[PDB]
Design a protein around this ligand. Structure first.
Ligand code: NA
Ligand code: NA
Ligand code: NA
Ligand code: NA
Ligand code: NA
Ligand code: NA
Lengths: 251, 251
């Protein structure tokens, strides 16, 4: 609150929308978010990135990719190199989303390589972290997330670390009758800030933006953003509907 | 030889080239392959697909994606849906490349779901298969590949099966002092054709195109294509250089 940290609301569209559908959504969004009091990012699928970035030129809407590889080029069929995003002037890249850690063998080692590559290619990484139902139930939330942060941010300079955007995903709450409370979210996010401080020092911790990446809807965002350590939101399904995403942006 | 099977040479660019670099390569390629005696496919990265497909309009150059997911849409951060490729009028999709099976948890179960989705979305699948050094050394090549073919092509109709393009990758030879010989390639490819026959019947086996997907260079293609059961090539690094790829196409 006392510390200056520009809030950031990023929409993770996940696997949704053709090129024309993607452009139609950002066209709808433009007049609804022109007065945002936060940074605004939309993250379309790879095949839509060029069209979406070109469509939002002249506005405050930034664009993120949903993943990338860490090498410059090479024998990685199906993968997208950081330089391919950089050539499109993409602003952000999501790294370590729970869905990629679960289904596609994303490891902490590859996350770390990707975060470093982001900085080498004028991309700001949105590093996702978070614990499972079983890890939370066993009381290991902070140990698990500390292990992710330690490994994923290894080797960064202070100047790089303070530019990372960290998104906390409460995987434990995915698919249940109750979402994390704003207090639960804030407590774990404050812990993450403490992990950053221990690694990079107090000034870096004071500056790093940390988003909540559990369920975010128009009716939850005001309470979430009022919390002491929450700097924004990595929004899932609500990001797919222009009016709903704009409500979250205009919290 | 007696059986009519249109030969097909497909260039797998893997993780190479920005949008402008990709378009420059296909522009160079167009006059060099206009007289091809085979089907010609280039497979750029996802972010390049729209630009490349638009650039090759009016020519014989078809375009393939290097991967896709199997669902229509959903919570699969970083993934590309079949309908996103279909909306760009993409022609082919590579499924089950060894690099994705090794690094990104591609399983036979997901390969099967992707092959079925290809047919549901006007995409022709290029299904990759092949055995490791250890599997070949243990004499299990055909058992291993049969397991892949059985699982990956499960549930197709005869009409769908005969349209699959199967690419045999001799993973066992990747990174060694000697590539597979043309005879070794042809023998395993003939075995794959027999696997198809046992699953779908003789007519389907007689029609299915089976490519070799080990090392293919301008100086190897003539011998490879002269073999009894080899219908084409899934080309790696040589596909990155217009003149080299054109030499392979014009075998
Ligand atoms: Na709590
Ligand atoms: Na919530
Ligand atoms: Na806040
Ligand atoms: Na042999
Ligand atoms: Na060879
Ligand atoms: Na032949």
């Amino acid at each position: 609150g006392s510390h200056m940290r520009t809030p950031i609301i990023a929409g993770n569209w996940k696997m949704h929308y053709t090129i024309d559908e993607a452009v139609k959504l950002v066209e709808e969004l433009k007049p609804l978010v022109k007065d945002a009091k936060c940074e605004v990012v939309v993250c379309p699928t790879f095949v839509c990135l060029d069209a979406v970035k070109k469509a939002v030129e002249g506005t405050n809407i930034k664009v993120g990719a949903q993943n990338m590889h860490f090498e410059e080029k090479g024998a990685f069929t199906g993968e997208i190199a950081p330089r391919m995003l950089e050539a499109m002037n993409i602003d952000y890249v999501i790294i370590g989303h729970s869905e990629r850690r679960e289904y596609f063998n994303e490891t902490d080692e590859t996350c770390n390589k990707k975060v470093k590559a982001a900085f080498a290619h004028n991309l700001t990484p949105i590093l996702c972290c978070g614990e499972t139902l079983e890890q939370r139930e066993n009381g290991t939330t902070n140990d698990v997330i500390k292990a992710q942060i330690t490994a994923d941010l290894e080797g960064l300079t202070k100047e790089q670390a303070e530019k990372v955007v960290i998104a906390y995903e409460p995987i434990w709450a995915i698919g249940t009758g109750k979402t994390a409370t704003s207090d639960q979210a804030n407590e774990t996010i404050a812990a993450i800030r403490a992990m950053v401080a221990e690694m990079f020092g107090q000034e870096v911790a004071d500056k790093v933006r940390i988003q909540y990446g559990g369920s975010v809807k128009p009716n939850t965002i005001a309470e979430q953003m009022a919390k002491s350590d929450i700097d924004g939101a990595l929004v899932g399904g609500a990001s797919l509907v222009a009016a709903d995403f704009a409500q979250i942006v205009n919290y």
